[PDB]
Amino acid sequence: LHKEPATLIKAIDGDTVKLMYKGQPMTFRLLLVDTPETKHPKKGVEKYGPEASAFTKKMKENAKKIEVEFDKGQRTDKYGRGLAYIYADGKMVNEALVRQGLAKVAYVYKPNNTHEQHLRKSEAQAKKEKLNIWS
Ligand SMILES: Cc1cn([C@H]2C[C@H](OP(=O)(O)O)[C@@H](COP(=O)(O)O)O2)c(=O)[nH]c1=O
Ligand SMILES: [Ca+2]
């Protein structure tokens, strides 16, 4: 796997962002995580939804460098969103959210699970500390 630069266009929510990738505006969906929904009516504004978005937003807006890291499988989901591990100044946003109890490790679709254990460990740590989602 390798990191590729991307430029923030707009953070949509905690796990979905619009990035300029290879001079192309693209919506990216954070691999292996699920931040609470703030959009979809069928889900409603979920607890920590807002917090997860602010977090991603903040992390990404304050970053000097944004990098996208595709996994070994599909790079896009059925919605056409790029599936990556996104890094803000070398910090994986996916993990950052999980570690904070702002996302749960979800949608682990092999073989796009390269950092699953990593994220799982951070999630365990967040549950362990009863952070946000786990509080
Ligand atoms: C993270 C991720 C989401 N998705 C799909 C699973 C869900 O489809 P459905 O929308 O049909 O439930 C949806 C979850 O994304 P969101 O959390 O943005 O809703 O996106 C993938 O297909 N692959 C992935 O790796
Ligand atoms: Ca989500």
| The residue count for the chain | 135
DSSP characters for 14-83? SSEEEEE-SSSEEEEEETTEEPPPSS-TTT-S-TTHHHHHHHHHHHHHT-S-EEEEE-SS-SB-TT--EE
Task: Write out residues with Cβ below 6 Å of ligand 1.
Answer: 15-16, 29, 31, 34, 77-78, 83, 107, 109, 112
CB contact at 8 A, 98 and 10: no
CB contact at 8 A, 119 and 112: no
Q: Is residue 5 reached through a cis peptide bond, with omega within 30 degrees of 0 on the bond before it?
A: no
CB contact at 8 A, 135 and 100: no
DSSP category for residue 100? T
The two beta strands, 66-70 and 16-20, are unpaired
Q: Quick one: which H or E segment has residue 114?
A: none
Report the residue among 31, 79, 110 best suited for mutation to probe ligand 1: largest number of ligand atoms under 8 A from its CB: 79
Q: Which residues contact 52 (CB under 8 A, 6 or more apart)?
A: 13, 14, 15, 35, 36, 38, 97, 102, 103
The domain limits of the chain are 1-135
Residue 95: helix, strand or coil by DSSP? helix
Specified resolution (Å): 2.0
CATH class belonging to 1-135: mainly beta
CB contact at 8 A, 112 and 72: yes
Annotated binding site for Ca(2+): 15, 34-35
What residue's CA is closest to ligand 1, atom 16? 34
- β-partners of residue 85 are 69
